[PDB]
Enzyme design. Structure first.
Site, short mmCIF file in Angstrom:
data_model
loop_
_atom_site.label_atom_id
_atom_site.label_comp_id
_atom_site.label_asym_id
_atom_site.label_seq_id
_atom_site.Cartn_x
_atom_site.Cartn_y
_atom_site.Cartn_z
N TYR A 134 0.67 -1.55 0.05
CA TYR A 134 0.13 0.18 -0.08
C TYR A 134 0.49 0.95 0.00
O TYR A 134 1.66 1.23 0.59
CB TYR A 134 -0.82 -0.21 1.28
N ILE A 176 -1.33 3.25 9.72
CA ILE A 176 0.20 3.19 8.17
C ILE A 176 1.16 2.92 9.03
O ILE A 176 1.81 3.58 9.75
CB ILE A 176 -0.13 4.21 8.03
N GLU A 177 1.96 2.24 8.75
CA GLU A 177 2.88 1.84 8.77
C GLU A 177 4.95 2.00 8.07
O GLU A 177 5.71 1.92 8.49
CB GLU A 177 3.61 0.22 9.90
N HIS A 178 4.36 2.18 7.02
CA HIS A 178 5.53 2.59 5.86
C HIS A 178 4.82 3.46 4.52
O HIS A 178 3.83 4.00 4.96
CB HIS A 178 5.85 1.48 5.28
#
Length: 272
Positions: free
Chosen positions: A81, A124-126
């Site tokens: 994503y 959202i982690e990246h």
């Protein structure tokens, strides 16, 4: 006093179903994870560990009729994503709106059928902040158009969050559940809460939201690091956290593991 617990659901094909998870009576919020594919020329997609999307329709409604709020989480720990361009943000915003936050229209078809969810969770982690601010502005716009739903976020425990801090500073999120795990700089480490208590003071003082929840893994196996026994959470944490106007309760990673450990039952005095 009374405790609100939020829990992530959808991480394993073999987990206690969604309705049975709601029927437990332990949770105020159930977060379905994850819409993990979007942006970059990609069509949106769900990775809910093989559970049938349509099969969740009656379960979401059952959950809601028992007053449990059901949210869809976008992003996730892993996934292709990204929301790099302005048109990606707009595309995803209207897709989430038509297909999840509103009653049905018939030139398409809702992944979860005729169920309408209670909100969107930014996990959202990246990817950096990218256009997540823009995405949140549009969703927030719709929320001001008479279709009230909640916007939440699940940032890592280091403040400010590299991926969401910028957006969180806009104060658009109704609730934040900080991940106090998988990062020794800000979670429980070796009979040592100093790092955790410090992270918590920072988030509850500086985070621009009405509610900040503490996120913990429900079992030693559920996360790389940060697991803290229930008895220690109640004794260590709760006294200092309730003293905060922004204390929301706790977030649990995740349902599949809580079923095994019975962490929420221990935290609450075990029950319904």
């Amino acid at each position: 006093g009374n405790l609100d617990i939020a829990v992530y659901w959808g991480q394993n094909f073999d987990e206690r179903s969604l309705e049975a998870t709601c029927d437990s009576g332990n949770y105020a919020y159930v977060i379905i994870g994850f819409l993990n594919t979007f942006g970059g020329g990609q069509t949106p997609a769900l990775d809910i560990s093989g559970h049938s999307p349509s099969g969740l329709e009656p379960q979401i409604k059952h959950c809601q009729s028992k007053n449990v709020k059901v949210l869809l989480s976008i992003g996730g720990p892993a996934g292709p994503y990204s929301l790099d361009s302005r048109s990606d943000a707009n595309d995803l915003a209207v897709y989430l709106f038509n297909n999840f936050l509103l009653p049905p229209g018939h030139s398409e078809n809702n992944p979860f059928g005729n169920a309408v969810l209670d909100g969107i969770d930014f996990h959202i982690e990246h990817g950096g902040p990218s256009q997540y601010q823009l995405l949140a502005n549009i969703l927030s716009s719709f929320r001001l158009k008479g279709t009230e739903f909640a916007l939440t976020a699940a940032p890592q425990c280091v403040y400010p969050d590299p991926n969401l801090g910028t957006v969180i500073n806009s104060a658009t999120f109704d609730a934040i559940w900080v991940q106090f795990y998988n990062n020794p700089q800000c979670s429980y480490s070796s009979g040592n809460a100093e790092a955790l208590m410090n992270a918590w003071r920072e988030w509850s003082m500086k985070a621009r939201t009405k509610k900040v929840f503490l996120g913990f893994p429900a079992h030693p196996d559920a996360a790389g690091s940060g697991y803290m026994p229930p008895a220690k959470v109640k004794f260590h944490v709760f006294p200092a956290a309730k003293k905060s106007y922004k204390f929301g309760g706790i977030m649990l990673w995740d349902s599949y593991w809580d079923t095994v450990s019975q962490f929420s039952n221990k935290i609450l005095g075990d029950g319904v």
